Amino acid sequence: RPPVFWLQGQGCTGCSVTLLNSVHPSIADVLLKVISLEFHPTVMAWEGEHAIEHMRKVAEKFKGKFFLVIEGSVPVEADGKYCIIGEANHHEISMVDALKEFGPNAAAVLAVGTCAAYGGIPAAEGSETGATAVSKFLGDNGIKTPVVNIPGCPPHPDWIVGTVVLALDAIKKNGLEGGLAEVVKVLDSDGRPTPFFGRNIHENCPYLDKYDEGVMSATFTDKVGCRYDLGCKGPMTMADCFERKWNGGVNWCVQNAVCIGCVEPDFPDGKSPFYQA
Amino acid sequence: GRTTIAIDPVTRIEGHLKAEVVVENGKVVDARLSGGMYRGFETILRGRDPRDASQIVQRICGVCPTAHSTASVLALDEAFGAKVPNNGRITRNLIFGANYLQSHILHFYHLSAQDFVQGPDTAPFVPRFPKSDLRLSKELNKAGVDQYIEALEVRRICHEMVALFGGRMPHVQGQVVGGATEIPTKEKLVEYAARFKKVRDFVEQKYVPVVYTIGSKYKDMFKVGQGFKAALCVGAFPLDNSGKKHLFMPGVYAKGKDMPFDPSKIKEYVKYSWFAEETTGLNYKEGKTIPAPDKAGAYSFVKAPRYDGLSLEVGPLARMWVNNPELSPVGKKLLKDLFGISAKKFRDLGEEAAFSLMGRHVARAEETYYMLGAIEGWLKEIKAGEDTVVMPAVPASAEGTGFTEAPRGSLLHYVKVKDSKIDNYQIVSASLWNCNPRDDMGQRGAVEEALIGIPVDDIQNPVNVARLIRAFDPXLACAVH
Ligand code: SF4
Ligand code: SF4
Ligand code: FCO
Ligand SMILES: [Cl-]
Ligand SMILES: [Fe+2]
Ligand code: NI
Ligand SMILES: [S]
């Protein structure tokens, strides 16, 4: 079980909650059998300066071999004062600082959620914190650590867990450098694992017949027609929600209402207004 | 003889919180809480189609998104003039109430229980404080761990209930201005009730008992954490279409006195918050959010809300105290057996014990039980197949306010629409009421004050600082937004 540090910047913790909803494997199995989640402020036992010190002791022991999950975007305005994630040595730690410290020494960075991957809502029109995507922030600072984007607001648990297993199985078969190269090969131009983001929702939507017939729902509660006029962004969205659906398979956005394109890099503004085409 | 302790991050909460206390003669004598992360939803929302708000604002928090969804659609309902169908009112209650169960179960087991239970000998359950003050027997402790692990599946099932009519979770698609987007079918109501049975059983047989049990091993924790002993409830879960009967009814409790809830008496101070000096003292209808991250003297991105100048707390304790319902059966039983206390209604714990570190865990477990009956009712009240939504037009100019109770306390959204776009949007959230800094008058926030008097007999293992905080179930993403 490789060591994993989970750092939260400008996040809503939705990435962590969706992971707790993992079915196969259960979250208990992921934690106890797949990864060693050494730092995670929402669920870990210790606290404060000691939790940070523990992470540093593990980071220094496993330099170059630990995996760094980043939730939320990184605010660069005001010298990082818009996201303080901890304090050690009477020294406040910003997300900018923390990412410069640990980013270089990770085997890989998993930017989970649209905020970390692409900037998302904290980076949208009207914001003023300098919210920055992880891959951009690292490049801007000369950090060459590979980044895998697992977007979505939130991602499906299978997308996060699935990508970790994908990379761990690659690394077992081909070693660290070779395994990560095999991973990059299966990323699309937006950094996303094609197993989960390789198919367009609309092209696979069960209401595609109604769409072509031009039969549109006019009220949300009308489950016969296509949802396009209500605002469905399925036609511009790459995810497998039509197949694996959500929360143990009980529903998904297009059946219930509309797709809002939460996995795409221009979320939210490029997918807004949500409730008109 | 004064020692200052700083804890950043406070873990097993949601979001970014620094706690700084001064310890004197083995007790906290001063406290400051800093919400360290800001996003600025109230400015981000400006200029948008108002209907977008009921998706955007959920991203305030991924633990309680259905609460922000609810407050937003209620505010939009008033602004748009939308008459929500009766069946949609019930569907909303089913969507939202199911996350009350998830959030309360999540909090006690996966955030709070490690305060009292030693987990397996692997990360993230180790390492921890050498002297963690973990008092439980080997037998009860393993029961703790067994229930923690079971709670993982139970809370996942709660989100399955949410998603059945809500579309997915976190971040529901199923609540919009005008009602609910998916009519409950008989088939999916069975799927909802099937899961509800499993959660009910876990709540009645495991969660409520273990809170009383574990508390009995920590009776000193009922004698600290009283703070201001002042509470707020704004009402939640409409029981009719008149807007006057609710599962939790509004009310304020302060200085031993019950008083009605008047929202014009809410103001948000910013002297010790990182916002422009000129924006202080505002009611939410005139609220302003101008970040000032370098402003001297400030130490938090959380505004300081005050009710008529009062610093109040919110949450299950606040609601159960204000509403003073009947206690659960097993609560009466175990208060008798394990604490030598005779009680029928929630206030029979008395003010000192209810307003305590461990009392707030008790209030949360009791409320979880209380909610079981509400949901059962709505599963009977709902009419499979009946329409749940109206499709209202966007108003050119309007305002609305949505009031509800999030799992962690009172929540309101206010929206002002101008030119068919959002002109102002102001959020007064639950952990805002609990985890705020001093107001312009130097009065501390609710948890800042409740920390006063907490025991720290071992400055190197100061476990009671964060234990007290966790009893309030904080969510700093909600508090700052
Ligand atoms: S517009 Fe939306 S609902 Fe219609 S076919 Fe495409 S994905 Fe399906
Ligand atoms: S259906 Fe659309 S909005 Fe819903 S989770 Fe998938 S990509 Fe996101
Ligand atoms: N519950 C929840 Fe979130 C907070 N605090 C809100 O409101
Ligand atoms: Cl909620
Ligand atoms: Fe606010
Ligand atoms: Ni929250
Ligand atoms: S929350």
CSV table of C-alpha atoms in Angstrom, one decimal, chain A residues 1 8-15 17-18 20-23 26-28 31-32 35-52 54 75 78 81-88 92-93 121-129 152-155 218-223 230 246-253 255-260 262 267-269 272-276, chain B residues 6-16 18 36-41 43-46 48-49 51-52 54-56 58-63 102 106 110-111 114 120 122-130 148-149 152-153 155-156 159-160 163-171 173-176 180-183 188 195 289-294 301 387-389 391 460 462-463 466 470 477:
chain,number,residue,atom,x,y,z
A,1,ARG,CA,0.0,0.0,0.0
A,8,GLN,CA,-7.5,20.2,0.5
A,9,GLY,CA,-7.2,23.7,-0.9
A,10,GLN,CA,-10.3,25.6,-2.1
A,11,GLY,CA,-12.5,22.5,-1.8
A,12,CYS,CA,-16.0,21.7,-0.6
A,13,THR,CA,-14.9,18.2,0.6
A,14,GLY,CA,-17.3,16.7,-2.0
A,15,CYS,CA,-14.4,14.7,-3.5
A,17,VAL,CA,-17.6,12.3,0.4
A,18,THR,CA,-18.0,10.8,-3.0
A,20,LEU,CA,-16.8,7.3,0.9
A,21,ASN,CA,-19.7,6.1,-1.4
A,22,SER,CA,-17.5,3.6,-3.2
A,23,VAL,CA,-19.2,0.3,-3.6
A,26,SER,CA,-15.8,-0.4,-0.3
A,27,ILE,CA,-14.0,2.5,1.2
A,28,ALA,CA,-13.0,0.4,4.2
A,31,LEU,CA,-8.1,2.3,3.1
A,32,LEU,CA,-7.2,-1.0,4.7
A,35,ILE,CA,-3.5,2.6,-0.1
A,36,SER,CA,-2.1,3.9,3.1
A,37,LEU,CA,-3.8,7.2,3.7
A,38,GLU,CA,-1.2,8.8,5.9
A,39,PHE,CA,-2.6,12.3,6.0
A,40,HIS,CA,-6.2,13.3,5.4
A,41,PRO,CA,-7.6,16.1,7.7
A,42,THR,CA,-11.2,15.0,7.4
A,43,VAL,CA,-10.8,11.4,8.7
A,44,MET,CA,-7.3,11.0,10.3
A,45,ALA,CA,-6.8,10.4,14.0
A,46,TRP,CA,-4.1,13.0,14.8
A,47,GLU,CA,-4.4,16.8,14.4
A,48,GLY,CA,-2.6,20.1,14.0
A,49,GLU,CA,1.1,20.4,14.0
A,50,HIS,CA,1.6,16.7,14.8
A,51,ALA,CA,-0.4,15.6,11.8
A,52,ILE,CA,1.7,17.8,9.6
A,54,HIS,CA,3.8,13.0,10.6
A,75,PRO,CA,-5.5,30.5,-4.7
A,78,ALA,CA,-2.6,37.8,-1.6
A,81,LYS,CA,-3.6,34.0,2.3
A,82,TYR,CA,-7.0,32.7,0.9
A,83,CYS,CA,-6.2,29.1,1.8
A,84,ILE,CA,-4.2,28.3,5.0
A,85,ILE,CA,-4.3,24.6,5.6
A,86,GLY,CA,-2.2,24.2,8.7
A,87,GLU,CA,0.5,25.6,11.1
A,88,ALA,CA,3.8,24.0,12.1
A,92,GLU,CA,1.3,29.2,8.8
A,93,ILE,CA,1.1,26.9,5.8
A,121,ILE,CA,-16.2,27.3,-9.4
A,122,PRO,CA,-13.6,29.1,-7.2
A,123,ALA,CA,-12.0,30.2,-10.5
A,124,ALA,CA,-15.3,31.2,-12.1
A,125,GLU,CA,-16.6,34.7,-13.0
A,126,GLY,CA,-16.9,36.9,-10.0
A,127,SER,CA,-14.1,35.3,-8.0
A,128,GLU,CA,-11.1,37.3,-6.7
A,129,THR,CA,-8.7,34.7,-5.0
A,152,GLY,CA,-16.2,16.0,-11.9
A,153,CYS,CA,-18.1,18.1,-9.3
A,154,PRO,CA,-17.9,15.7,-7.7
A,155,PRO,CA,-16.3,12.7,-9.6
A,218,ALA,CA,-41.1,20.8,-21.4
A,219,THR,CA,-41.3,20.1,-17.6
A,220,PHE,CA,-38.6,18.3,-15.6
A,221,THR,CA,-41.1,15.7,-14.4
A,222,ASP,CA,-41.7,14.5,-18.0
A,223,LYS,CA,-39.4,11.6,-18.3
A,230,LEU,CA,-34.4,22.0,-20.3
A,246,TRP,CA,-24.7,7.2,-9.4
A,247,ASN,CA,-25.0,6.0,-5.8
A,248,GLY,CA,-25.2,2.3,-6.3
A,249,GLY,CA,-26.9,2.7,-9.6
A,250,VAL,CA,-30.1,4.3,-8.3
A,251,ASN,CA,-30.2,7.3,-10.6
A,252,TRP,CA,-28.2,9.7,-12.7
A,253,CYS,CA,-28.5,13.4,-13.7
A,255,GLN,CA,-32.9,10.7,-15.8
A,256,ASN,CA,-33.5,12.9,-12.8
A,257,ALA,CA,-33.2,16.3,-14.4
A,258,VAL,CA,-30.3,17.5,-16.6
A,259,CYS,CA,-26.6,17.0,-17.1
A,260,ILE,CA,-24.7,20.2,-16.2
A,262,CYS,CA,-19.5,19.0,-14.3
A,267,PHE,CA,-17.4,24.1,-15.8
A,268,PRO,CA,-19.3,26.1,-14.7
A,269,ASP,CA,-19.4,29.2,-16.9
A,272,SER,CA,-24.2,27.9,-17.8
A,273,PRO,CA,-27.0,28.8,-17.8
A,274,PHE,CA,-27.7,25.3,-16.7
A,275,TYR,CA,-31.5,25.4,-17.4
A,276,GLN,CA,-31.5,26.6,-21.0
B,6,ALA,CA,-2.4,26.4,18.5
B,7,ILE,CA,-4.1,23.6,16.5
B,8,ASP,CA,-4.1,23.9,12.7
B,9,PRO,CA,-5.5,21.9,11.1
B,10,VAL,CA,-8.3,20.8,13.5
B,11,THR,CA,-8.9,17.3,11.9
B,12,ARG,CA,-12.0,15.2,11.7
B,13,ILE,CA,-14.1,18.3,10.9
B,14,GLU,CA,-14.9,19.6,7.4
B,15,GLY,CA,-12.8,22.4,6.1
B,16,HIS,CA,-10.0,24.5,7.3
B,18,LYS,CA,-7.2,26.9,13.3
B,36,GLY,CA,-8.5,29.8,6.9
B,37,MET,CA,-10.0,29.3,3.4
B,38,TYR,CA,-12.1,31.7,1.3
B,39,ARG,CA,-13.9,31.3,-2.0
B,40,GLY,CA,-16.4,34.1,-2.2
B,41,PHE,CA,-19.6,32.5,-3.4
B,43,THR,CA,-19.6,37.5,-5.4
B,44,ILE,CA,-19.1,34.5,-7.7
B,45,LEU,CA,-22.9,34.2,-8.0
B,46,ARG,CA,-23.5,37.8,-9.2
B,48,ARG,CA,-26.0,34.8,-13.2
B,49,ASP,CA,-29.4,33.4,-14.1
B,51,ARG,CA,-31.8,29.3,-11.4
B,52,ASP,CA,-28.1,28.6,-11.6
B,54,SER,CA,-29.4,26.2,-6.8
B,55,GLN,CA,-26.5,24.3,-8.4
B,56,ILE,CA,-23.6,26.7,-7.7
B,58,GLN,CA,-24.3,23.4,-3.3
B,59,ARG,CA,-20.5,23.6,-4.0
B,60,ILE,CA,-20.2,25.6,-0.8
B,61,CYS,CA,-20.1,22.2,0.9
B,62,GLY,CA,-20.1,18.6,-0.3
B,63,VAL,CA,-21.3,17.2,3.1
B,102,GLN,CA,-26.1,10.5,6.5
B,106,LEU,CA,-21.0,10.5,9.4
B,110,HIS,CA,-16.3,8.9,11.1
B,111,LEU,CA,-15.5,12.3,12.6
B,114,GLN,CA,-12.1,8.5,17.3
B,120,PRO,CA,-7.0,-0.3,13.8
B,122,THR,CA,-2.8,1.5,10.5
B,123,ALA,CA,-3.2,4.9,8.9
B,124,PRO,CA,-5.3,7.0,9.1
B,125,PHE,CA,-6.1,5.7,12.6
B,126,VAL,CA,-2.4,6.0,13.7
B,127,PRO,CA,-0.3,7.8,14.8
B,128,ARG,CA,-2.2,9.9,17.4
B,129,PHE,CA,-1.6,11.5,20.8
B,130,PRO,CA,0.4,9.2,23.1
B,148,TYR,CA,-17.6,2.7,12.8
B,149,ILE,CA,-17.0,0.2,10.0
B,152,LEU,CA,-19.6,3.4,6.5
B,153,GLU,CA,-22.1,1.3,4.7
B,155,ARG,CA,-24.1,6.4,5.5
B,156,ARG,CA,-23.5,5.3,1.9
B,159,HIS,CA,-26.9,8.8,0.0
B,160,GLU,CA,-28.6,6.1,-2.1
B,163,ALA,CA,-30.1,10.1,-5.0
B,164,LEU,CA,-33.3,8.1,-5.7
B,165,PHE,CA,-35.3,11.3,-6.1
B,166,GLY,CA,-32.3,13.7,-6.0
B,167,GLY,CA,-30.4,12.4,-9.0
B,168,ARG,CA,-27.0,11.9,-7.4
B,169,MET,CA,-25.1,12.9,-4.2
B,170,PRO,CA,-23.0,15.0,-3.5
B,171,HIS,CA,-24.8,17.8,-5.3
B,173,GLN,CA,-29.9,17.7,-9.5
B,174,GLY,CA,-33.5,17.1,-8.2
B,175,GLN,CA,-34.3,20.3,-6.4
B,176,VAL,CA,-35.1,23.4,-8.5
B,180,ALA,CA,-38.7,18.6,-7.5
B,181,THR,CA,-37.7,17.4,-10.9
B,182,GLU,CA,-38.6,13.7,-10.5
B,183,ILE,CA,-42.0,12.3,-9.5
B,188,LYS,CA,-38.6,3.8,-6.1
B,195,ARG,CA,-32.9,1.4,2.7
B,289,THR,CA,-18.7,40.6,1.0
B,290,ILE,CA,-15.5,42.5,0.2
B,291,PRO,CA,-12.4,40.5,1.1
B,292,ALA,CA,-9.6,42.2,3.1
B,293,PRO,CA,-7.1,39.4,3.7
B,294,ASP,CA,-4.4,41.8,5.0
B,301,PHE,CA,-12.7,34.6,6.9
B,387,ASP,CA,-46.6,15.9,-10.2
B,388,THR,CA,-43.9,17.5,-8.1
B,389,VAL,CA,-42.8,20.6,-10.1
B,391,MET,CA,-42.0,25.6,-14.4
B,460,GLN,CA,1.3,17.9,25.5
B,462,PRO,CA,-4.5,18.7,24.9
B,463,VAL,CA,-7.2,16.4,23.4
B,466,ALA,CA,-10.6,19.6,19.5
B,470,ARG,CA,-15.9,18.4,17.1
B,477,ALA,CA,-16.6,25.5,4.0
